[PDB]
C-alpha cells in the first residue's frame, strides 16, 4: 500500500526511486565520502507459492521397522517415506542413538589427584603401628581441649558440661596461628586411623563417609585412647575404608608381606594417575559402519530392492567427511551435534622449545633477618611441566617401573601405563635446552594422546566425568552419494549397520585397550529424524518433476577421491616396493601417501577385529597423520622402464626425493632438511605457489589438513663426539645434575648432595665444546601429495596430463618404490591413488532411485 | 536506541578491537571463569630447599 | 592523596603519514594536488621545522 | 561541552549539484534502528 511505498518499507529501491543522476554521484564516489549508507531499499520475502499451507511436519520422526543385533553390531532399517508432494534433502537426516556407555575403570577424566590433593605428597595419615605399639607417644593432633575426663574424653560445655561425639578434624583448630596458642596446658587431641586399615599415604585417600556428619566409621562404630603419669591428650581412632581413586604408590618400601600394617616402612609415597579422557569419536567415527563389504547399507525404493550404495572397501569414506569438513568449515570450532571437535595436540608439547625458565630473582620463604627458604618457582613449574605433559608420554621403554610393585601383563592395559613412570633426569629442562628440537624418542610416536590436547577434551567432558554415562547423540549421514542427496516423493528403505565395540567407537588418550577394561552397551534406541521443508506443494510438484526427468539428475563426487591401499612394512625395514598390473590411467590425478603404525588400523572387514586393541586417534580414520618425517625417497616407474616425474622435470631426475639427510652437496631447502625440489612439488601442489615466487601461503588456502600449516622446521646442536676430546657419553642413569635438590633416577623425593654436574656439554658459552647439528621436519596432520599433472601445479580437477592419450589410450604397468627410515614396532604404509569417484542418481518412476558409480583409475 | 547501536555496531564491525575514542570495550567474561573446566592440576613433585618441605606449587 | 593525571600515547612500528592531497585523504596515486604541478615546469622549496 | 564535526572539503561546483538533488523529495534519506523494535518489558513475581 502507498503509505508503505512512500516510507520505502517495501517497493522501490534506493537504486530505482533515486533520480538516476544521484545514484551516480554515489557510485562515482564511494571510496571517499560514501553515502550509499544514507539511503534505503526494502527487502521483502516471497508473497506465496513457497509455503505449505496445510499440516506438513517439520522434523518428521521415523523409528525402525526392522531391527537386528549381533554381539558386535547393530542393524536397523527405516521405511523413510518422503511422501507425495514434497522434497527431502538427506543433509539434514541424522540418526539419533541413546544408550548407556560405561566408560571403563580407566577414565580418569581429571588429571592430577582429587582427594586431599594439596598434600605434602608423600606422607602418612596418622596411623598406628604394629607388633603391640602401646610403648611410645607420637604427638600430632588438633582440637585444643580442657580436661578429658575420659570414659567420655575431650569436652566442650553448656551451663553443665559436655564430653564429645564421633571429634571432628575436618579441620579443627590452632586458629591463632602466629601464637599457635600452644598445648593449652591441658588435654587436646585429634583422630587416628589405627591398624587394620590399609596404611596408604595421606593423599588420594577417600572414605565413603558413614556418619552423615561426614565421620568416617567402620559400620560397626569404633574409637578411644591414652593409658589411665596421667591423662595428657587423647586420640579417637578407627578402621575406615581408605582407597584412592587416583594414585600409584611409587616407593612402597618393600615389606611385601605385612601390608595393612606399617612399622615406618609402611609410610611410602604416591602420585596422581595419568589421565585418559575416554570419550566418544569426533565425527562420530565408527558409530556407523562405513566402507566394509559385510555390514554395509541401503537406501532403495520399497519397490525394487535396488540399493544405492555400493561401498567398495577402499574408499576411506570417513576420512572424507573429515576432510570435507576442512574445506567447507574450520575445525577449530567445536559444534556438538555431529560431535565435531577435531583433534590436535598443543604445539608446545610436540615441538617443545626449551625457551628456558625465567625466574631471574629469588623466589624466597617467610614463616608465619627473617628465616626462610626458596623454591625455583617458574622453574619447578617447568620440571612439573616437562615430566608431565611430554616425557611420561614417551615411548614405552625409556620408562622405568618402580620397585616392589608389579604391573599386569598384556601391555597397553591401563594398569600398565600408570604403573611405570618416566625419569625427571632426562627429557626435562636438562635436554636440548634453548632449542626447538622436538624430543627424538617420541619423534615417531602418536603425539595425540596428550591430556593437553583440545578436541579430545571437549567430548570427554561433553559427556561428563563419570564411568557411567547415558548418552544422547546424533550421527550425520556420512556417505558421499547420500549425504547431500535430494529425494523425490515415495517410500524408501534406509538401512545401516552400527558398531558397538568400544575399542572402535570411543577414542581414549593413552590407548589402553578399552576393549579389555570396559565399555558401551546399548543402543537402547535408534530412530532417524529428518527435517523436511514446508515447501508449498504446487511448487514442489514442479521441483519434483523436474528433478525426475533425466537430463537434470543429481550427481555427488566424494571429496577425497581415493583408491587407498595398505602396504605392510616389516618390523625394521625400508624400501617398500609396489607393482600394479597393466591398466588404464584415464583420469588419474596424482598420488597421496603416508605411513601408519599397524596397531592403529582395523582390518576394515568383519567388524570386530580382535588384533585391533589400540584406541588413540586412529590415523587411518581420524585424519591425523604423524609420520611424514620418516620418508626418504620415492621412485615411480612406468612399464618398468620410464620414471614418471621424469623428462628431467625435477632435480635428481628419477627419485622425487623428500628428505635428504647428511648428503647435502647443497640441496636441503629451508633451514631444515627437506629438499628444495620437494617443497616445490609439495607447495606447488597444494597452494599452487612455487614457480613464480615462493610466498607464505595465503590463508584461505592453508586449511589445517594442508602443508604450510605444518612443516615446522626444527634444529639443534650436540657434542660432535669425534671432535671435542671428551665426549664421555655419560648414560642417563649417571648424569648428576640438580645434584639432588630434585629426584633420584625416578619421580621420587629429594635425595641430593650438591655438585656442579654433567648436564649437557655446555654448547652456548665461553668454553662450549664444539658441535654438529641435525634438522627434522615434522609435517604431521597432512599427507604428501604427488599430482599427476605434467607440471606439478594444479589447473583443474582433472590434471593436464590425465587425459593425455598414452595414459588413457592403452594399458600400462606401474612400478614404484618408497623408502622410509627404520622404525621398530612394525608399521604399515598407506597410499592414495586419487581418482574421480563421481556418482549420478536418476529416478523416473516416482519411488525408485537408480544410482550409477564410477572410479576411472581402479574401477574394481 | 541504547542497545541497538551495540547491536548495530556488531555487523558492520568486530567489536573485539578496542577503539578508545568511543570507549569501545565489549563486556566479556573469561570462559575459564564462567564455564568452569576443572581438569585438575599437573603435579609430580614441586620441592623445597634451604638457603626441606613441599608445596604442590601447581595446586 | 591528590591526582594530576599524566597521559601519553605510545605508537610503535607505524610511520606518521601527512598524506599530500587535499581532503588529506587517499583517492589514488598521483594525488590531486600533485597532479597540478605536473606539466608546468615549475619549481618550489619546502622548509618544514 | 563542545560540539565537533567534520566537513568533507567537497567541490563547491559539486556540492551544489549534490544539493539541488538531495533536496528534491524524490531523493530523501531514510534510516532505521538495527534492533528495530519495541520493548515491552513485563515483571516476574519473585519466586514464580
Amino acid at each position: 500500500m502507498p503509505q508503505w511505498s512512500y516510507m520505502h518499507i517495501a517497493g522501490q529501491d534506493a537504486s530505482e526511486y533515486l533520480s538516476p543522476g544521484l545514484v551516480q554521484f554515489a557510485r562515482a564516489t564511494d571510496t571517499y565520502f560514501s553515502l550509499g549508507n544514507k539511503f534505503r531499499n526494502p527487502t521483502v520475502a516471497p508473497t506465496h507459492d513457497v509455503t505449505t499451507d496445510r499440516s506438513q511436519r517439520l522434523t518428521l520422526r521415523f523409528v525402525p521397522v526392522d531391527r537386528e543385533d549381533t554381539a558386535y553390531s547393530y542393524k536397523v532399517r527405516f521405511t523413510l517415506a518422503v511422501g507425495d508432494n514434497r522434497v527431502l534433502d538427506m543433509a539434514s537426516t541424522y540418526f539419533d542413538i541413546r544408550g548407556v556407555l560405561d566408560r571403563g575403570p580407566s577414565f580418569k577424566p581429571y588429571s592430577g589427584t582429587a582427594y586431599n590433593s594439596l598434600a605434602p605428597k608423600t606422607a602418612p595419615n596418622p596411623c598406628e603401628w604394629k607388633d603391640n605399639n602401646k610403648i611410645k607417644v607420637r604427638g600430632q593432633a588438633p582440637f585444643i581441649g580442657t580436661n578429658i575426663n575420659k570414659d567420655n574424653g575431650i569436652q566442650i560445655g553448656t551451663d553443665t558440661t559436655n564430653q564429645p561425639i564421633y571429634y571432628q578434624p575436618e579441620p579443627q583448630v590452632g586458629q591463632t596461628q602466629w601464637n599457635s596458642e600452644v598445648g593449652a596446658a591441658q588435654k587436646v587431641a585429634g583422630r587416628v586411623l589405627k591398624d587394620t586399615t590399609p596404611m596408604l599415604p595421606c593423599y588420594g585417600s577417600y572414605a565413603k563417609p558413614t556418619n552423615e556428619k561426614g565421620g568416617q566409621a567402620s559400620l560397626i562404630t569404633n574409637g578411644t585412647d591414652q593409658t589411665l603419669n596421667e591423662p595428657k591428650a587423647v586420640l579417637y581412632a578407627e578402621n575406615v575404608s581408605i582407597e584412592a581413586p587416583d594414585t600409584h604408590l611409587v616407593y612402597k618400601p618393600d615389606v611385601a608381606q605385612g601390608t595393612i600394617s606399617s612399622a615406618d616402612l609402611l609410610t611410602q609415597q604416591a602420585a596422581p594417575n595419568r589421565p585418559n579422557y575416554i570419550g566418544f569419536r569426533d565425527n562420530f567415527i565408527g558409530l556407523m559402519y562405513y566402507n566394509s563389504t559385510g555390514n554395509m547399507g541401503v537406501l532403495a525404493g520399497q519397490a525394487s530392492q535396488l540399493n544405492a550404495v555400493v561401498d567398495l572397501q577402499d574408499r576411506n569414506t570417513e576420512l572424507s567427511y573429515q576432510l570435507m569438513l576442512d574445506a567447507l568449515g574450520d575445525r577449530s570450532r567445536y559444534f556438538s551435534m555431529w560431535n565435531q571437535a577435531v583433534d590436535s595436540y598443543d604445539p608446545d608439547v610436540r615441538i617443545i622449545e626449551n625457551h628456558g625458565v625465567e625466574d631471574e630473582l629469588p623466589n624466597y620463604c617467610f614463616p608465619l633477618n627473617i628465616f626462610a627458604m626458596e623454591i625455583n618457582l617458574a622453574a619447578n613449574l617447568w620440571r612439573s611441566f616437562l615430566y608431565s605433559n611430554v616425557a611420561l608420554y614417551l615411548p614405552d621403554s625409556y620408562k622405568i617401573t618402580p620397585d616392589n610393585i608389579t604391573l599386569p601383563e598384556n601391555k597397553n592395559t591401563y594398569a600398565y601405563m600408570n604403573g611405570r613412570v618416566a625419569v625427571p633426569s632426562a627429557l626435562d629442562t636438562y635436554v636440548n635446552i634453548g632449542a626447538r628440537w622436538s624430543p627424538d624418542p617420541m619423534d615417531n610416536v602418536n603425539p595425540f594422546n596428550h591430556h593437553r590436547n583440545a578436541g579430545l577434551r571437549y567430548r570427554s567432558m561433553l559427556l561428563g566425568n563419570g564411568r557411567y554415562v547415558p548418552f544422547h547423540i546424533q550421527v550425520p549421514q556420512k556417505f558421499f552419494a547420500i549425504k547431500n542427496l535430494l529425494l523425490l516423493p515415495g517410500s524408501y528403505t534406509y538401512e545401516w549397520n552400527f558398531r558397538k565395540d568400544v575399542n572402535m567407537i570411543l577414542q581414549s588418550s593413552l590407548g589402553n585397550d578399552l576393549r579389555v577394561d570396559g565399555a558401551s552397551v546399548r543402543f537402547d534406541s535408534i530412530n532417524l529424524y529428518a527435517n523436511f521443508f514446508p515447501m508449498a506443494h504446487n511448487t514442489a510438484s514442479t521441483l519434483e518433476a523436474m528433478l525426475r526427468n533425466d537430463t537434470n539428475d543429481q550427481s555427488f563426487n566424494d571429496y577425497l577421491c581415493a583408491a587407498n591401499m595398505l602396504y605392510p612394512i616389516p618390523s625394521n625395514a625400508t624400501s617398500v616396493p609396489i607393482s600394479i598390473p597393466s591398466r588404464n590411467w584415464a583420469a588419474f590425478r596424482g598420488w597421496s601417501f603416508t605411513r601408519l603404525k599397524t596397531k592403529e588400523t582395523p582390518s576394515l572387514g568383519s567388524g570386530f577385529d580382535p588384533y585391533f586393541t589400540y584406541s588413540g586417534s586412529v590415523p587411518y580414520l581420524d585424519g591425523t597423520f604423524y609420520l611424514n618425517h620418516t620418508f626418504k625417497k620415492v621412485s615411480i616407474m612406468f612399464d618398468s622402464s620410464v620414471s614418471w616425474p621424469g623428462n628431467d622435470r625435477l632435480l635428481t631426475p628419477n627419485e622425487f626425493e623428500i628428505k635428504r639427510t647428511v648428503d647435502g652437496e647443497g640441496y636441503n631447502v629451508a633451514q631444515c632438511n627437506m629438499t628444495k625440489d620437494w617443497f616445490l612439488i609439495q607447495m606447488l601442489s597444494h597452494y599452487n605457489i612455487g614457480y613464480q615466487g615462493f610466498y607464505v601461503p595465503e590463508s584461505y588456502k592453508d586449511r589445517m589438513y594442508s602443508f604450510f600449516r605444518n612443516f615446522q622446521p626444527m634444529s639443534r646442536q650436540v657434542v660432535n663426539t669425534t671432535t671435542y676430546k671428551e665426549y664421555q657419553n655419560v648414560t642417563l642413569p649417571f648424569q648428576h645434575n640438580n645434584s639432588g635438590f630434585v629426584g633420584y633416577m625416578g619421580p621420587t623425593m629429594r635425595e641430593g648432595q650438591a655438585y656442579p654436574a654433567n648436564y649437557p656439554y655446555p654448547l652456548i658459552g665461553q668454553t662450549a665444546v664444539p658441535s654438529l647439528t641435525q634438522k627434522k621436519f615434522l609435517c604431521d596432520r597432512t599427507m604428501w601429495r604427488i599430482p599427476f599433472s605434467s607440471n606439478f601445479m594444479s589447473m583443474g580437477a582433472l590434471t593436464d596430463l590425465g587425459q593425455n592419450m598414452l595414459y588413457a589410450n592403452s594399458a600400462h604397468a606401474l612400478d614404484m618404490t618408497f623408502e622410509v627410515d627404520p622404525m621398530d614396532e612394525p608399521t604399515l604404509l598407506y597410499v592414495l591413488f586419487e581418482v574421480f569417484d563421481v556418482v549420478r542418481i536418476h529416478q523416473p518412476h516416482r519411488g525408485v532411485i537408480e544410482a550409477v558409480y564410477l572410479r576411472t583409475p581402479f574401477s574394481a | 536506541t541504547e542497545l541497538s547501536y551495540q547491536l548495530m555496531l556488531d555487523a558492520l564491525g568486530d567489536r573485539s578491537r578496542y577503539f578508545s575514542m568511543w570507549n569501545q570495550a565489549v563486556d566479556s567474561y573469561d570462559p575459564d571463569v564462567r564455564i568452569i573446566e576443572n581438569h585438575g592440576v599437573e603435579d609430580e613433585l614441586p620441592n623445597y630447599c634451604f638457603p626441606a618441605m613441599e608445596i604442590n606449587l601447581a595446586a | 592523596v591528590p591526582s594530576l593525571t599524566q597521559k601519553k600515547f605510545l605508537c610503535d612500528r607505524t610511520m606518521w603519514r601527512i598524506p599530500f592531497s587535499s581532503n588529506f585523504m587517499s583517492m589514488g596515486a598521483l594525488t590531486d594536488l600533485g597532479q597540478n604541478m605536473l606539466y608546468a615546469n615549475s619549481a618550489h622549496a619546502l622548509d618544514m621545522t | 561541552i563542545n560540539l565537533y564535526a567534520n566537513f568533507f572539503p567537497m567541490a563547491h561546483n559539486t556540492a551544489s549539484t549534490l544539493e539541488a538533488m538531495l533536496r528534491n523529495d524524490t531523493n530523501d534519506q531514510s534510516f532505521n534502528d538495527y534492533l528495530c523494535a519495541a520493548n515491552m518489558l513485563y515483571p516476574i513475581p519473585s519466586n514464580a
Binding site: 534506493a14 557510485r27 571510496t31 539511503f39 526494502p42 | - | - | 528495530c36
Partner: peptide, 26 residues
C-alpha cells in the same frame, strides 16, 4: 537486526586509467 542499505548499481573507478587504494605503494 535489519540492514537493507542502498547504493548498488555497481561502482565507477572509471577507466582511461584505473582503481584507487593503490594496489602497492605506501
Amino acid at each position: 537486526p535489519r540492514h537493507g542499505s542502498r547504493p548498488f548499481m555497481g561502482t565507477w573507478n572509471e577507466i582511461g586509467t584505473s582503481q584507487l587504494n593503490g594496489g602497492a605503494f605506501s
